[PDB]
C-alpha cells in the first residue's frame, strides 16, 4: 500500500557510477566487505549493497540503496530511476538512445 | 530538458498516448513535470522559415 505512494511521476532520472557491493553482514566486528581489527568503528561501518549514482542534475549522491532494484541489476552506466525528494533508486528504466537514432528503426 | 536534466514523467488529462510522438516538442508544467500539450516539432526553422515567399 506504500509503495504505491512513492511510486508517483514525475521522477529524477540517473545512471549508476559504481556499485560498491559492500558486505551489509559478514561480521558485528564491521558491517562492511573490509575485515580490521577492533570493534566498535560506529557508523564508519554501515556500508552494504550501495549504489553511488551519478544524477542527471550532474551531481554524485551516494546512498544505500532500495532492494527493490537488485545490485544484479546495476552495472556501471545503467538508466536507473532515482526518486527526486530523497535520492533512492526508485526503479530501473530499460536503457534508451538518442531520439535521433531511434527514428532511423 | 534544455538546461539538461532528464525526468520521466506521465501522461496529460488533454492528450493520450497517440498525440505524442517521439522526437516531439512537448509542454511540460513548471509546477510537476508532465507532458501537457504536444507542440509543432523543430526550434530549427528561423533560416528557412524566412525564405517562404
Given at each position: 500500500?506504500?509503495?504505491?505512494?512513492?511510486?508517483?511521476?514525475?521522477?529524477?532520472?540517473?545512471?549508476?557510477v559504481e556499485v560498491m557491493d559492500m558486505n551489509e553482514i559478514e561480521d558485528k566486528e564491521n558491517s562492511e566487505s573490509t575485515t580490521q581489527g577492533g570493534n566498535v568503528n560506529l557508523d564508519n561501518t554501515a556500508v552494504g549493497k550501495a549504489a553511488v549514482?551519478?544524477?542527471?542534475?550532474?551531481q554524485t549522491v551516494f546512498l544505500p540503496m532500495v532492494g527493490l532494484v537488485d545490485p544484479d541489476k546495476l552495472k556501471?552506466?545503467?538508466?536507473?530511476?532515482?526518486?527526486?525528494?530523497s535520492y533512492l533508486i526508485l526503479d530501473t528504466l530499460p536503457s534508451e538512445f538518442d531520439s535521433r537514432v531511434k527514428a532511423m528503426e | 530538458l534544455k538546461q539538461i536534466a532528464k525526468f520521466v514523467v506521465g501522461l496529460?488529462?488533454?492528450?493520450?498516448?497517440?498525440?505524442?510522438?517521439?522526437?516531439?516538442?512537448?509542454?511540460?508544467?513548471?509546477?510537476?513535470?508532465?507532458?501537457?500539450?504536444?507542440?509543432?516539432?523543430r526550434i530549427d526553422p528561423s533560416v528557412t522559415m524566412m525564405t517562404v515567399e
Open positions: 500500500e506504500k509503495i504505491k505512494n512513492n511510486r508517483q511521476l514525475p521522477y529524477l532520472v540517473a545512471n549508476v549514482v551519478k544524477t542527471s542534475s550532474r556501471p552506466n545503467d538508466l536507473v530511476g532515482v526518486n527526486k525528494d | 496529460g488529462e488533454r492528450v493520450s498516448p497517440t498525440d505524442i510522438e517521439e522526437g516531439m516538442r512537448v509542454g511540460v508544467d513548471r509546477s510537476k513535470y508532465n507532458i501537457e500539450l504536444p507542440l509543432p516539432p
